[PDB]
């Protein structure tokens, strides 16, 4: 039981902009995804300050970066607040319709694609390097779900029955045939040091 | 009926760091406060995407910058999600205890105070220029309240019975005797153009 959904017109436009525009500095995708994980972890930290039982589903708050050369994937895993089903459908908790409008209109005024995260749609930058993204998420108020898309104008949402993860979100990036450098230990270290070295949560680089 | 509260030790430490450290680039305070307003407006936009009645208390989403030379104040007003009383008490909706720890430890590694907003405690930068900050806030799930402090280690929270504002938050900065340049039309234009020209909500500069 997979359900299919059409992206809203503005989002479908953003994604094909992201895919089609010649932009060489693709490496920012990782920063924009580490940010999202950082915000997710902010949100559960807060929520527990008044209710320590929200942490029943995992006391530890971190980010993992898991490269895998066999499947050509890099996964960003975090133990943050996760997303409910309704959230996944509503542009994965972002305000993407109006954030795309503000983004499109910043590009009218000399912005580059690296400013994507200033408008709340940083997530889409995963398409700078991924031909297909899978978001496995679990929130305390709901079950585990997998969101998926290869762009094209539509996304899928099914309940995930695989590996119960407890609480958080897992962005699997099925990388493009020529972006396999984002699976290098060396290269990921460089990017994380360069673009998010003062993120307030431990990031672990898994090895293969 | 004012209630007084002691800041948590880490927050009280951050604020006196902010007050006492020689740092010349005080102008970033404004960016960090425009951000907060921007995030507040993000949050109510989202909330209405599934329930358009949250906007019953104001359909328009903007930021205003109101300088006033007579009282030596600059106010940042927004029609975002506002804060409940519990929020105001819990460090004004931030995660300031652990965000201060991450901030303190970034300064251990060559961060400057301008990176305050990367740790979620940007709000405190208002003390770069303000001897006293007053936060008047209204959220849909609660009444209108005023939070206040001149540092010293304590803050006050009372119900505000003055100007019912509908929905949003209002940071009144009672400026320091020698930071009156942040009341200049000229100077605020320069700062807003320089540091937040791609913020996704209209900012209006009131005139006097
Ligand atoms: N790390 C996350 O929870 C996340 C991932 C993709 C989009 C939005 C998100 N909030
Ligand atoms: N603009 C606001 O709603 C706001 C102000 C100060 C601190 C936190 C906030 N979320």
Q: What sign results for the dihedral spanned by CA atoms B49, B55, B60, B66?
A: negative
DSSP symbol at B173: E
Q: Between β-strands A168-175 and A154-159, what pairing exists: parallel, antiparallel or unpaired? A: unpaired
Shortest CA distance to B15 belongs to which of B153, B107, B176? B153
Sign of the four-CA dihedral A17, A20, A25, A27: positive
**C-alpha of residue A175 to centroid of ligand 1, in Å:** 18
Q: How many CB atoms lie within 10 A of CB B56?
A: 12
User: What was the elucidation method?
Assistant: X-ray
Measured distance CA(B173)–CA(B179) in Å, rounded: 11
Give CA–CA dist A157/A147, Å, rounded.
5
Distance A75 CA to ligand 1 centre (A): 12
Q: Residues B180, B131, B186, CA angle at the centre, nearest 5°?
A: 20
Cα A167 from Cα A83, distance rounded (Å): 9
Q: Is the dihedral of CA B54, B59, B65, B66 positive or negative?
A: negative
End-to-end CA distance of chain A: 34
In order of B32, B202, B203, the CA distances from B196 in angstroms are: 9, 11, 10
B78 known ligand binder: yes
Residue B179's Cβ-side half-sphere holds a number of Cα atoms within 13 Å equal to 23
Go through chain B and tell me how many residues it has. Answer: 208
Closest chain B C-alpha to A117 CA, distance in angstroms: 11
Can you point out the beta strands (E) in B41-106? 63-68, 73-78
Token pair, residue B38, equals 């921007």
- Spatial separation of the C-alpha atoms in residues B79 and A102, rounded to whole Å: 18
Asked if B157 and B5 count as a contact pair (C-beta separation under 8 A), the reply is yes
DSSP per residue over chain A, as a string? --EEEEPPHHHHHHHHHHHHS--S-GGGHHHHHHHHHHHHHHHHHHHHHH-GGGGGG-S---EEEEEETTTTEEEEEE-S----HHHHHTGGGS-HHHHHHHHHHHHTTS--GGGGGGTT-GGGGGGGTEEEEEEEEE-TTS--EEEEE-STTEEEEEE--SS--SSEEEEEEEE-TT-GGGG-HHHHHHHHHHH-TT-SS-EEE---
Ligand nearest to the CA of A117: 1
Nearest CA to B75 among B199, B166, B183?
B183
Structure tokens at B169: 């938050």
Q: Give every CB contact of residue B30 below 8 A, 6+ residues apart in sequence.
A: B76, B182, B188, B191, B192, B195, B196
Q: With a 6 A CB cut-off, is B127 part of the ligand 2 pocket?
A: no
* CA–CA dist A182, A162 (Å, integer): 26
Question: What is the Cα–Cα distance from A69 to B197, expressed in whole angstroms?
Answer: 41
Burial letters A73-107, b for 16+ CB under 10 A, else e: bbbbbbbbbbbbbebbbbbbbbbbbbbbebbeebe
Q: Which residues of B touch A (CB under 8 A)?
A: 42, 45-46, 49-50, 86, 90, 93-95, 98-99, 102, 106, 109, 111, 115, 118-120, 197-200
The DSSP bridge partners found for residue B170 are B77, B136
Tokens of A49: 């300050």
- DSSP, collapsed to helix, strand or coil, labels residue B35 as helix
Q: SS3 of B67, please?
A: strand
> Shortest CA distance to B33 belongs to which of B113, B144, B124, B149?
B124
Question: Is the Cα torsion angle B99, A28, A148, A77 positive or negative in sign?
Answer: negative
Neighboring chain A residues of B31 at a CB cutoff of 8 Å: none
Number of C-alpha atoms within 13 angstroms, CB side, residue B184? 9
Whole-number Å distance, alpha carbon B169 to ligand 2 midpoint, is: 7
Output the six-digit token pair for A103: 């983004």
With H, G, I as helix, E, B as strand and everything else as coil, classify residue B10.
Answer: helix
| Encoded tokens for A50 | 């008044």
CA distance A169 to A202: 16
Token output for A70:
């066999």
Q: What is the DSSP letter of B72?
A: T
Q: Which residue is closest in CA terms to ligand 2's atom 9?
A: B36
Strands A203-205, B154-159: pairing kind = unpaired
Q: Is the CB of residue A175 less than 8 Å from the CB of residue A74?
A: yes
| Phi, psi at A96, each rounded to 5° | -75, -30
CATH class of B1-208: alpha beta
Structural tokens at position A45: 């930290």
**Max CA separation in chain A (angstroms):** 47
Is the separation of the CB atoms in A30 and A191 below 8 Å? Answer: yes
Give me the residues paired with residue A74 across strands. Answer: A67, A173
* Cα A141 from Cα B173, distance rounded (Å): 39
Judge if the beta carbon of residue B125 lies within 6 A of ligand 2: no
Name B1's Cβ contacts closer than 8 Å, sequence gap at least 6.
Answer: B158, B159
Q: Are B23 and B115 in contact (CB under 8 A)?
A: no
**Residue B171 CB–ligand 2 contact under 6 Å:** yes
Which atom of ligand 2 lies at the shortest distance from residue B39's CA? Answer: 10
Residue B155 near residue B7 (C-beta atoms within 8 A): yes
């Amino acid at each position: 039981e997979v359900e299919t959904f059409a992206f809203q017109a503005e989002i479908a436009q953003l994604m094909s902009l992201i895919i089609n525009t010649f932009y060489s500095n693709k490496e920012i995708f990782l920063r924009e995804l580490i940010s999202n994980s950082s915000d997710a972890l902010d949100k559960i930290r807060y929520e527990s300050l008044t209710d320590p039982s929200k942490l029943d589903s995992g006391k530890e708050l971190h980010i993992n970066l898991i490269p895998n050369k066999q499947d050509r994937t890099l996964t960003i895993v975090d133990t943050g607040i996760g997303m409910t089903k309704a959230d996944l459908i509503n542009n994965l908790g972002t305000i993407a319709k109006s954030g795309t409008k503000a983004f499109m209109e910043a590009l009218q005024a000399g912005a580059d694609i690296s400013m994507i995260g200033q408008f709340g749609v940083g997530f889409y930058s995963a398409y700078l390097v991924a031909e297909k993204v899978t978001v496995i998420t679990k929130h305390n108020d709901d079950e585990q779900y997998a969101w998926e898309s290869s762009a094209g104008g539509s996304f899928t949402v099914r309940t995930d029955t695989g590996e119960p993860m407890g609480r958080g979100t897992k962005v699997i990036l099925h990388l493009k045939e020529d972006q396999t450098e984002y699976l290098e230990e060396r290269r990921i270290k460089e990017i994380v040091k360069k673009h998010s070295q003062f993120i307030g949560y431990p990031i672990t680089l898994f090895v293969e």
